Paper text:
In eukaryotic and archaeal cells, the initiator tRNA carrier is the e/aIF2 heterotrimer. In its GTP-bound form, this factor specifically binds Met-tRNAiMet and brings it to the initiation complex. The γ subunit forms the core of the heterotrimer and contains the GTP-binding pocket. α and β are bound to γ but do not interact together. We were able to observe GTP hydrolysis by aIF2 or by its isolated γ subunit.
Comparison of the structure with the wt-aIF2γ-GDP-Mg2+ structure shows the transition between switch ON and switch OFF states. In the GDP-bound structure, the magnesium ion is still bound but three water molecules and one oxygen of the β phosphate define the equatorial plane, whereas another water molecule and the hydroxyl group of T23 are in apical positions with respect to Mg2+. Changes of the coordination of the magnesium ion are correlated to the structural change following the loss of the γ-phosphate previously termed the loaded-spring mechanism. Overall, the conformation of wt-aIF2γ−GDPNP differs from that of wt-aIF2γ-GDP by a rotation of domains II-III with respect to domain I by ca. 14°. This rotation is partly due to the movement of switch 2 helix, and to the subsequent remodeling of its interaction network with β17 and the following loop of domain III. In addition, transition of switch 1 position from ON to OFF causes release of interactions between domains I and II involving the strictly conserved R219 residue.
Author numbering: 2 to 38, 48 to 415
The structure:
């Protein structure tokens, strides 16, 4: 019997619309992520049939029938996938990507010219947020000749050559007909390994959703505290731990604007449909709390950072960022130059995957100083920052950096 454990790794699935992201996640997990009426999420166990040859030995359920054996397969690990509905939701979650994803799959349709517009954008975005454990999946090989597939494969290798992605593998599949999916599972095991995690690091969690789960007319004894949804960035949380929500509540007192942390306690921990006593990075987690549900209703806490109640975590209104920029971005028409950062500019800053607006107060060499609309939690040195600028009416990623404390 396979164990019941949390996912230990989260994989973002990106690529141009209709290239087959959701079909691919279904082929792997058996789950259709967009059966909802907001992020698609799906988990699967991964195993291997010890006496079978690879890649067919790799399986996603406890059976070896797919490789002609009656044996029970060995359990390797549980993994999960993030699959967004549409470009705008996807790009929005990419701003939190570093916290959410241990790796990524870029889906490329074999029957469309490469690269498609969102293909280019998603690939650039992955570099910016630093999620570079990448697999490129060449999908829909069932509707082109082997020659056409081979030709596109070589275009892609030419594209990645000279970039950070030069050594990224390309795995051809048909998500629809489940062809060569076992090769992809094998590739996930090789190229998106579970990271080394130092579980003695101070616990930090990003909040991506918050809920009031009480139906109307719920009686007193059946009421629940506010529920928080998110991803554990580092460390380990436990049931019954005291925690605080950062920066907290915005307050106007003694002639100043300030933020007061929200203190509470973890009542329960859930991954998918199982309850746990602890929670580590990997997977999206649901945290039950003792919060008044009015504080969590309608994603009120979205973008909060959660730590233990006594954590020494600075919450800063002004930050210094050491950064680098893109040379150009793709305009709807054609290439737009990325202008240097100038004082007084308004930027969107994603700091350790929590996002706010800010005004540049100083620029020198490769550092900026920014005054933020609300303050950000900074729990270590070299917290990665995404810098975005409004270009032609839209926020665009233009750079990345590290927060210097
Ligand atoms: N022929 C073929 N069609 C596919 C394959 N994978 C997906 N499709 C089709 O492509 C369309 C878009 O797929 P979908 O998973 O919704 O793409 P997404 O927008 O990237 O999530 C659907 O009609 C799928 O059935 C494949 O491997 N072969
Ligand atoms: Mg989809």
């Amino acid at each position: 019997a396979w164990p019941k454990v949390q996912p230990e790794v989260n994989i973002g699935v990106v690529g141009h619309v209709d290239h087959g992201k959701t079909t691919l996640v279904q082929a792997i997990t058996g789950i259709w992520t967009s059966k909802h009426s907001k992020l698609g999420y799906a988990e699967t166990n991964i195993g291997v049939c010890e006496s079978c040859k690879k890649p067919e030995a790799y399986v996603t359920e406890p059976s070896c029938k797919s490789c002609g054996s009656d044996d029970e397969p060995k359990f390797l690990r549980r993994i999960s996938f993030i699959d967004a509905p549409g470009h705008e939701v996807l790009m929005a979650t990419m701003l939190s990507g570093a916290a959410l994803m241990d790796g990524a799959i870029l889906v490329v349709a074999a029957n469309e010219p490469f690269p498609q517009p969102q293909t280019r954008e998603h690939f650039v975005a992955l570099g910016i947020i630093g999620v570079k454990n990448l697999i490129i999946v060449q999908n829909k090989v069932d509707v082109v000749s082997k020659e056409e597939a081979l030709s596109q494969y070589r275009q892609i290798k030419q594209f990645t050559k000279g970039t950070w992605a030069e050594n990224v593998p390309i795995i051809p599949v048909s998500a629809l007909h489940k062809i060569n999916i076992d090769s992809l599972i094998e590739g996930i095991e090789e190229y998106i390994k579970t990271p080394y995690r130092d579980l003695s690091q101070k616990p930090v969690m990003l909040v991506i959703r918050s809920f009031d789960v009480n139906k109307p007319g719920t009686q007193f004894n059946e009421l629940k505290g506010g529920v928080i949804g998110g991803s554990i960035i580092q460390g380990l949380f436990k049931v019954d731990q005291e925690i605080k929500v950062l920066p907290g509540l915005r307050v106007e007192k003694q002639g100043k604007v300030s933020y007061e942390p929200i203190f509470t306690k973890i009542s329960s921990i859930r991954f998918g449909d199982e309850e746990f006593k602890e929670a580590k990075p990997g997977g999206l987690v649901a945290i039950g709390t003792y919060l008044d549900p009015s504080l969590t209703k309608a994603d009120n806490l979205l973008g909060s950072i959660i730590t233990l109640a006594d954590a020494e975590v600075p919450v800063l209104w002004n930050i210094r960022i050491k950064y680098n920029l893109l040379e150009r971005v793709v305009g709807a028409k054609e290439m737009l130059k990325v202008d240097p950062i100038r004082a007084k500019e308004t930027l969107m800053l994603s700091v350790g995957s929590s996002t706010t607006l800010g005004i540049v107060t100083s620029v020198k060499k490769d550092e900026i100083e920014v005054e933020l609309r609300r303050p950000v939690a900074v729990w270590s040195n070299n917290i990665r920052t995404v810098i975005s600028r409004q270009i032609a009416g839209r926020w665009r990623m233009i750079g990345w950096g590290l927060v210097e404390i």
